[PDB]
Design a protein around this nucleic acid. Structure first.
Lengths: 88, 119, 101, 73
RNA sequence: CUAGACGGUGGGAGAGGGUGGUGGAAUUCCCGGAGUAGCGGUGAAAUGCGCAGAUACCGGGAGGAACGCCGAUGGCGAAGGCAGCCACCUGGUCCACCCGUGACGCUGAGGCGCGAAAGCGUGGGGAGCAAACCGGAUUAGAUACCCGGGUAGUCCACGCCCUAAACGAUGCGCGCUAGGUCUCUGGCGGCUCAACCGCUGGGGGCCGAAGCUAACGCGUUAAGCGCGCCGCCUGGGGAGUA
């Protein structure tokens, strides 16, 4: 699982400013975190399909927030990606 | 011809026949009776009357080995199982206790068609 | 780490020594897995509702620990290895849900 | 009718989560190892649901029975 | 920008999923013990089993499969579907605070994925059950129903198949339109506490306003009043065939 520590560490590491909890950057970060763990869990447990839907959704909600980033600030976007290391 | 006195009586009821087996304080049978042991051959074998006769036959014969007191153990349900538990109480033997120990699975083997259509 | 509750039921026929030896391996085992013994209780002997290993009684050990969940499963594999150990139940500690109060 | 007495009322303030209180737990069992219905346990859907896990945990440990024989009949 | 949506902090319930572990009941078989003449089975029977000793009973062992009570009128899941306990890994979801982002939305042809049983391929397993099959009986005949056996299969793994009273016979989202009653799960609140009660949120049922409907019935879990998008019908058979 992801400890509160593990969590806030990412939240503060992405926040746009002191106290930023829901910036697109943050959200995307937290989702990238959950995804990876799940993608991991799933490298083993290739049968746990039920959890896999959960992933399809995380990946979904993420690629959809990112889509929103370009549209708005095309810079923060390229910025977030490079950082998080999304795409591939 | 051993002279036991105190023992067990197993009543095995079923919808086809009743068979009583008397035993010593720890399980080994002394004598046994059934619907067949006595007259009855087919359907008659089940009927409570037979159960009765068989119960008695069981006790009487066991009276020989000097039986007196017995613990009754009922297994299964069927054509007159209670009659057997009665013929005993009266047979002469002092019945110390009646106990239902009819086996039941915690769901193990698929039963034959005849006993399925359930769940 | 997470706070747990280890239960252990072992043979009620151990002599002062034999017993203290099994407890040895336990305490030893616990550390080997990160078990930080927060406390303990020892109701000892108790008349089981049904026989366990033919024996109608049992000796009880209760330890409330704190350890790396990623090993709690091993901790018990280990605890079950003993021959005198005839029961091992590790449980996540939980706030006492009161009732009729 | 089932109006003899609610096991809950006929008792004190206990921790439904405690799987070792053979003393109290044993109270919610039929004349067999069976767990009594709410009709008789006087517990609520939620309470009664927590009892079950506790009564079951207690069964594994050997403190509580799984099933007992019936006397009389 | 915050009324939608998403996020944060904090509470919560659950047979949601995956891996490993772990128990007892019962069936079958095997071993030991103890005991005779039948057991079994049916509407009656017979086949069958039993004196190489069966049947019921006690103890020991091996193996496979499933997991009473609780259990519900209950819960979970998108559906198919899902019910010992333990740990690990993991999905969804509700509530409180209103703290952060600031329309980041809805639907969704094709695609991709999931999708009971039976069935297929390789290997394993096989306790019980059981297509085919082998017998017994019933019958005018019995290629059936009933009874005794029994292979595939059912169980596991890996791959394939992709179907169905898969039903609430009620495509997805959103908004709007009396109540009453029972129920599962959360809440904060009222009486000095509690017991008791409140209303309030999510879910499951019943009855019913307005309304709808051919009728039956539906009735905030719509089949009502509206909007968006998808799929589908046009008559029946031929045919889900060529």
């Amino acid at each position: 699982p992801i400890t509160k520590e593990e969590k806030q560490k990412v939240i503060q590491e992405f926040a746009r400013f002191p106290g930023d909890t829901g910036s697109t950057e943050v959200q995307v970060a937290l989702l990238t975190l959950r995804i990876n763990r799940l993608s991991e869990h799933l490298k083993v447990h290739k049968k746990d399909h039920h959890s896999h839907r959960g992933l399809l959704m995380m990946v979904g909600q993420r690629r959809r927030l990112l889509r929103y980033l370009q549209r708005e600030d095309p810079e923060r976007y390229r910025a977030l990606i490079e950082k998080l290391g999304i795409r591939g | 011809k051993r002279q036991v006195a105190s023992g067990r009586a197993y009543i095995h009821a079923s919808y086809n026949n009743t068979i009583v087996t008397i035993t010593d304080p720890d399980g080994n049978p002394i004598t046994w009776s059934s619907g067949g042991v006595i007259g009855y051959k087919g359907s008659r074998k089940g009927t409570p009357y037979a159960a009765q006769l068989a119960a008695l036959d069981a006790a009487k014969k066991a009276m020989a080995y000097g039986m007196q007191s017995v613990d009754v153990i009922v297994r299964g349900t069927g054509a007159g199982r209670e009659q057997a538990i009665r013929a005993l109480q009266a047979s002469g033997l002092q019945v110390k206790s009646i106990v239902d120990d009819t086996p039941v699975p915690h769901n193990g083997c698929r039963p034959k068609k005849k006993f399925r259509k359930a769940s | 780490m997470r706070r747990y509750e280890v239960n252990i039921v072992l043979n009620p026929n151990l002599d002062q020594s034999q017993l203290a030896l099994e407890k040895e391996i336990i305490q030893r085992a616990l550390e080997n897995y990160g078990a930080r013994v927060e406390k303990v209780e020892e109701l000892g002997l108790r008349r089981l509702a049904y026989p366990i290993a033919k024996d109608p009684q049992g000796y009880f050990l209760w330890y409330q620990v704190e350890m790396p969940e990623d090993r709690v499963n091993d901790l018990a594999r280990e605890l079950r290895i003993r021959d005198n150990v005839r029961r091992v139940m590790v449980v996540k500690s939980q706030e006492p849900f009161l009732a009729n109060a | 009718p089932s109006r003899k007495a609610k096991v809950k009322a006929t008792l004190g303030e206990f921790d439904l989560r405690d799987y070792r209180n053979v003393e109290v737990l044993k109270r919610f069992l039929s004349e067999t190892g069976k767990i009594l219905p709410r009709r008789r346990t006087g517990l609520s859907g939620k309470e009664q649901r927590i009892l079950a896990k506790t009564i079951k945990r207690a069964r594994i440990l050997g403190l509580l029975p799984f099933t007992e024989k019936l006397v009389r009949k």
